[PDB]
Structure formats: C-alpha cells, structure tokens
Scaffold this active site. Structure first.
Site, PDB file in Angstrom:
ATOM      1  N   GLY A   1     -30.440  57.498 -54.513  1.00 35.08           N
ATOM      2  CA  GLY A   1     -30.740  56.147 -54.974  1.00 35.08           C
ATOM      3  C   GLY A   1     -32.237  55.950 -54.913  1.00 35.08           C
TER       4      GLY A   1
ATOM      5  CE  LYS B   1     -30.526  55.538 -41.260  1.00 33.78           C
ATOM      6  NZ  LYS B   1     -30.990  54.619 -42.337  1.00 33.78           N
TER       7      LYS B   1
ATOM      8  NE  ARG C   1     -23.125  54.341 -62.553  1.00 36.13           N
ATOM      9  CZ  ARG C   1     -22.950  54.506 -61.243  1.00 36.13           C
ATOM     10  NH1 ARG C   1     -21.822  55.020 -60.761  1.00 36.13           N
ATOM     11  NH2 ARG C   1     -23.922  54.161 -60.412  1.00 36.13           N
TER      12      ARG C   1
ATOM     13  N   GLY D   1     -23.928  60.520 -53.882  1.00 38.57           N
ATOM     14  CA  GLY D   1     -22.862  60.998 -53.016  1.00 38.57           C
ATOM     15  C   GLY D   1     -22.926  62.509 -52.997  1.00 38.57           C
TER      16      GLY D   1
END
Lengths: 415, 417
Positions: A373, A215, A39, A396
């Site tokens: 990720g 999950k 970044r 996000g």
C-alpha cells in the site's frame, strides 16, 4: 518455481469452452455507487482475449470485503455487474448464488459467448474455511462442506483462469479448489509473476531494496529473506531511528522507537555483513517540535542528534543526496516503503525525491517494483504508475512473496 | 535464536505495591444476547488479577479486544458483559468505561476504590489498535500514523507497570502489544506458561522430539513443516495431507481422496530436507476408506499398496497405522501436536485421532512434555475433556502457529528481560 507457470496467452484453442475466471473485485463502494473502477477495468484485457478467442461462457467469481460467510447487502457484487455492462457493451448476467445444480443450469442456456458474474464468494463460509455467525462468534466450516463447494466450482467450467494475484497467499477454495486440468494465470496474474520472478529468481545485479515505514517489528522476516537476494538496501523513514539508537547510540528525541524491533537490529546487521549487503541508513534528518503539518522544523545530522522534545519525520537533504548513487547504479529495485510521512506535505520531500530517482532509473533501463500500500498510494498520488516497471496490485500476496512465503494460489497453477 | 523464554513475568516482580497496573488480556469470548456462553478465557486471567490484587496495586486496568469490529464502535462486540462476569468471579464491583484512552478515562480511573479492577472497552473500536480498519460503508481505511502515536502514548499514560497476558495476539504488532512504552513490561501467568513450554520444546527439548502434523491441506503448512524439520527428530504426517504425500512418493492409487495440487509440488523439497536433516518421517500405511463423504457411509480397509478403488476416499488412518503410532509416540520425550489424523468430526472416522490422543496422554504420564498447537486439535482435546492430561494445550490460534513456523512474535519481543 515462480516464473514457469501456464498463462492465458498460451491456451491454444479455448474456443467453445466454458471458462471460470477468478478475479479481484474488492472495490470501494459508497451507497451502491462504485467509487473507484480501477480493478475490473484491469480485468477487461483477460475477459476480452477470452471473448475474441471463442469461449462458450465466461464465468466470473470474486470477493468484496470481509463478509465472513454470511450474506450481506453491504458487500454485494451486483453494482460490479452494472459497471461491466458499460465496459463490455453487452448485458452481463448476475446470479445470486455461486454454486448449485441450479446455477450451472442458468449458465447453460445463457447467451453464447457471454459473461456471467456470480455473487460474492465469501458469502459462503466454505470459501475461506472459517466464518462468524449472526452473533459474532467464530464458526468453522464442515470439511464435507468445503469439499462439496470445491467440487461445485470445478464443474461450473472446463478451464480455470486465475487473475487474482492479491489472494494467492491465502489457501482459499477459489485459489486451490478449482481442480480442472488447465489452470492458467490471467494477464494481471501473469504480469505480477513475470516481474516478481524477474527480481527474485534471476535478477540483474546490482539489486536494490528500498524499505521504509514506522515499525521494524512487523517487517522482520521481510528483511531477513531479502538479505539473501539483495545486493544493497535502503532502510528509512521511522524504522531508521530504531536502527540509529541501537547501532550508533544516536539521540532520538521523541521519534518513533520500536522496542520490539530494537531487540533484533543487531541480528539483521549481522546477517547484512554476512551476506555482504551495503546498508545506507539516513545520515541526517528533518525534525519537528510536534507531529502535525503546521509545526516548526529544522535539520540535524546523525552526530548532532535530536533535541529532547523533537522528532524526526523525514530524511535530511544529505541523505536525499546520498541516494543518488545508490538508486542510479542499481539495475533492479524493489521498493515498498516511504522514507517519511509523505501524507504530510512538509515531511514528504524524501519519498517524493526517492520516487523521482526510481522513475529516472527505470528510464535508464532498470527493472523497478513497487510493493505494498502506502508506497503505491504515493505512486498514485503523483500519478506515475507506468514510469515504474511494475506496481503490485494488492499487498497481501506481494508482502508474503517478498517475505519468502510460497503462495498457494501460484502453486495451484499449471506449467 | 535464544529470544523465547528468559523473559520477565509477574512471578519475580518486586515493588508492585501501590502501582497502576495495565493488563492486556484475551477476552475474545463467545456471546449471545449479552450472555457469555463460555467463560474459560475469563477465569484463566483470575490468577493474574488475583496475584496483582494480593500484592498491593492501586489500580488494575484491563484492556482487551473482542472479535473484529474493524475500528468502529459496534454493539455485538462490546466488552460490557465481561465486566458483569468478572464481578461474579472476583466478588466485587468492576468499573466498566466506554472509552479506553483520553482525559476522562484517566480521571475516572483515578477516583475509584484504591484496589479496584477496571475494564476498558474494546481496543479494536479504535482504528489505531490494529492500524487499519473499515469505514461505515465497507471500504478499507488506513489509520493516520500520528493518531496511532497518540493512541500508543495514551495507553502508556494509563499506568506505571505493564503486564501482557495475551499470547495469541502476540504474532501481531498492534498498539496494545508493542505500544505501551513503560519501563516494566512482563508476562502474565497464562503468557508465562505459553512462553515456558514452547521454549522448553523448541530450544532445548528432551530428545527424541516428535512432531505430529495433520489436516486437509498441505499447501498452507509448508512454512510450518519446513521450519520444524530443522529442530525435530520424528514427524508423523497424517490425514488428508498423507494422500498428497502418498501419491507423489509411492505412486499411490488415491481414489477421490483429498489431493493438494498446490502442495504436491513441494512434497519433493520436504523429503529432501527431511533426509538432509535426518528426520524420520512416518506416513500411514493403510486407511479407512468410504464410498461417500458422510458419517455412516460404506467403509472398508485398504493398504497403500492395495490402493483406494476409484470413487472411494480415504477419510481415516487404518488399524495397522494406528497400531504403528505406539512406538513413535511412546518413545518420544517431547511431542508437538498440530493436526488431527483424520475426519474426527465423524465418529466413524475418528478412531485415528482419538487413539493418537490416548497415546499422547500416555506419554505425558511417562514423563514427556506434550504440546497441542491446537485450534482444530484443541477442540478434540476439549471434546474428550483431556486438556489436563497434556502438559500444555496452547490457548492461541495464529500466535502458536507463527511461533512453530519460526517467526518472531512482536508481543513477546516487546517484553522486558
């Protein structure tokens, strides 16, 4: 809704105008030395196009970590200023505050056509809306104060550029606050929207989603929404054993069973048949007698099932083979989800082989997107970043988008 | 559909006598220098602990979190001063343990008074609770997936029966919420009460069901608004949002008032669905406007037709709109309320929200079921001290929002039937 937004590569005459660019500088730092420069490196093409295009000033605002509205030596943007000098070949002015009648007085009368970085936005409480005080108690910001902060940003510049896609899911002050006329995506934001739009708005069929991870329970809505857009789905790696025990009553051993998610797979599968989606669960498994790299392993199929103190940690060779026809026939793919514990060499074959196929299918011409990720960690471990159409920087917003959410930061942009 | 409520609880649980009971509690409580400055959240669990106590129970092991330590032992977020508070409330000794899993904890639990209450330290000190954390330097760190596995199976070793009294972190799938793989998984008294009212209002409500939404933004409440339109009959959109609606729909001269640029692009889509779903929408028709965003500024009143003069801003609903609340609220048999109707933190611009509150108090007594989504709406009810005059003031931030957004709530799903 998502692909008709105004972009930096259309802003005719930005010459001699003050430009505020919201960027993503949330970089790894360790004793004042930036551990990963990726970044900010990505920020240059937008910074540079602004340079060569005229532009009196280039004001840079971003955040680093979660300082929660308090000043914090640990999360300064100062070392980022240091780096930017080496990357631009010029001095970068770094100011200790974001807003004020004094900072707009140091931008004005600072070298023409220069870049200015302002200190961490989340040092103010009015960026997020909430903070924690010196003791660790949730503090909420005055409405008067948030409104003032947003007015202060809006008067730092003439044109707003948003090149921080990883925060577009939050309705923070830098996302929805800079109320200038011209609000355009930077190149990074542009490329994010372009590809997400390409796979979600009007994709070319067939359209594949490869899901994975432990999950089922946090990925409920992520699945629900996709079953609307998607033609085929691969459910794998961990969350599969929950699907297996509930649908095929398969014996699972001590494999990860998601009790919260078990309740809803029936619902998912109903929606799946309803929306006419092919499902492809694993048909066989590599199993181990203990959850570590150095343990005894063997292979069982879905019908043989797993011995009572063993656990599945990767898809078996037949399931691997089974996603040759699934990926290679797809003309667009949305990944996000490893097919087993790839961080563990032995139990990685599945995810690695899945990647090889996605790389191959991109070569065949398809459009491929890597989501969050983990999946990106794999793509980066293997150093394959640009054999895939797009790898989303920041999970996000990318999760939220894939989830069906609206994304305040994208809506705040012009058209 | 159907999943909310009809779950298990401490109420109607046989065979608790002589069992180790693991209770997931909400102890995320305000503190200064080891002095808890508001004990409400702690006293709230007293019914749960008491009933367990009064039923047998070898051990009552309490697990909880305080703040956001991000996977590191951090002294500002220790749960020690809570144990000190529980001692005062239960009138006995309370065992505080520095760890929360492992060899030593299991032993020190076992050799303790045979009806004891034990408080284990902050769950969020372990990276494996949330799943992610930050290291000593400030960089994001992700937990090993097999370490989570050990942590989750370690918490399951702690006890025979699991009780989850921590609605409010139900929307997150953390170890303490979905990891305790025990046969009996049941809701606490607080949890039971949350689950009871929300299903009462979101599954088979007495009609007409009214939603009252308010606040600054409309861009963050899109999913809330949308999901509520396919279950509600009446909706009031007030304060801050309202202007964004009034400019898009009525071409209102809005002044310096809060405009949601992100949200204005969705007002259309909302009104289409509201009409499609036959939901009456109610928007303020006059306003209290100021010449400055400040208490004790210059104030006057204008109708949406008159419009707000330039450099003036709407900060509260006007007298006719306030009057207009009567018929909407008092005729409702069930009310969901999540947002103040103005800038209530300033006395001069609080007449809206206060007068709203009194009407919600008034309809509860008329026999209606009223729910405060809260956070910001909660602090008003607190300030007015009318928390009792409402059927239910939800004691949960994001978990109540995500439920009202139509999401699933892992914590809930993980309970037995």
């Amino acid at each position: 809704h998502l692909g008709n937004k105004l972009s930096i590569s259309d802003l005719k005459d930005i010459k001699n105008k003050k430009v505020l660019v919201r960027v993503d500088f949330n970089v790894p730092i360790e004793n004042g030395i930036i551990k990963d420069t990726n970044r900010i490196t990505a920020t240059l093409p937008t910074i540079n196009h602004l340079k060569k295009e005229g532009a009196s000033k280039i004001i840079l605002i971003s955040h680093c970590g979660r300082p929660d509205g308090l000043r914090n030596e640990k999360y300064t943007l100062k070392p980022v200023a240091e780096t930017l000098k080496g990357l631009l070949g010029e001095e970068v002015l770094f100011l200790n505050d974001c807003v004020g009648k004094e900072v707009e007085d140091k931008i004005n009368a600072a070298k023409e056509n220069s870049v200015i970085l302002l200190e961490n936005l989340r040092f103010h409480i009015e960026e997020e809306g909430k903070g924690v005080d010196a003791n660790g108690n949730k503090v909420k910001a005055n409405k008067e104060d948030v409104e003032k902060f947003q007015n202060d940003l809006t008067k730092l510049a003439d044109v707003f550029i948003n090149d921080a896609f990883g925060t577009a899911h939050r309705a923070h002050s830098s996302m929805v606050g800079v109320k200038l006329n011209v609000k355009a995506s930077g190149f990074l934001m542009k490329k994010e929207l372009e590809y997400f739009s390409k796979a979600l708005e009007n994709p070319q069929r067939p359209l594949l989603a490869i899901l994975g991870g432990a999950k089922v329970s946090d990925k409920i809505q992520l699945i629900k929404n996709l079953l609307d857009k998607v033609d085929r789905m691969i459910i794998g790696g961990g969350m599969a054993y929950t699907f297996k025990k509930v649908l095929n009553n398969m014996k699972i051993g001590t494999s990860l069973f998601d009790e919260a998610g078990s309740k809803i797979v029936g619902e998912i599968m109903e929606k799946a048949k309803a929306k006419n989606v092919q499902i492809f669960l694993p048909v066989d498994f590599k199993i181990a007698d203990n959850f570590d790299n150095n343990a005894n392993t063997k292979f069982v199929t879905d019908e043989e099932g797993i011995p009572d103190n063993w656990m599945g940690l990767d898809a078996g060779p037949k399931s691997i083979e089974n996603y040759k026809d699934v990926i290679l026939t797809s003309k667009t793919v949305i990944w996000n989800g490893p097919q087993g514990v790839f961080e563990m060499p032995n139990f990685a074959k599945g995810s690695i082989e899945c990647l090889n196929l996605v790389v191959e299918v991109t070569k065949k011409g398809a459009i491929t997107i890597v989501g969050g990720g983990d999946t990106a960690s794999l793509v980066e471990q293997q150093n394959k970043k640009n054999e895939i159409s797009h790898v989303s920087t920041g999970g996000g917003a990318s999760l939220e988008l894939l989830e069906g959410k609206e994304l305040p930061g994208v809506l705040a942009l012009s058209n």
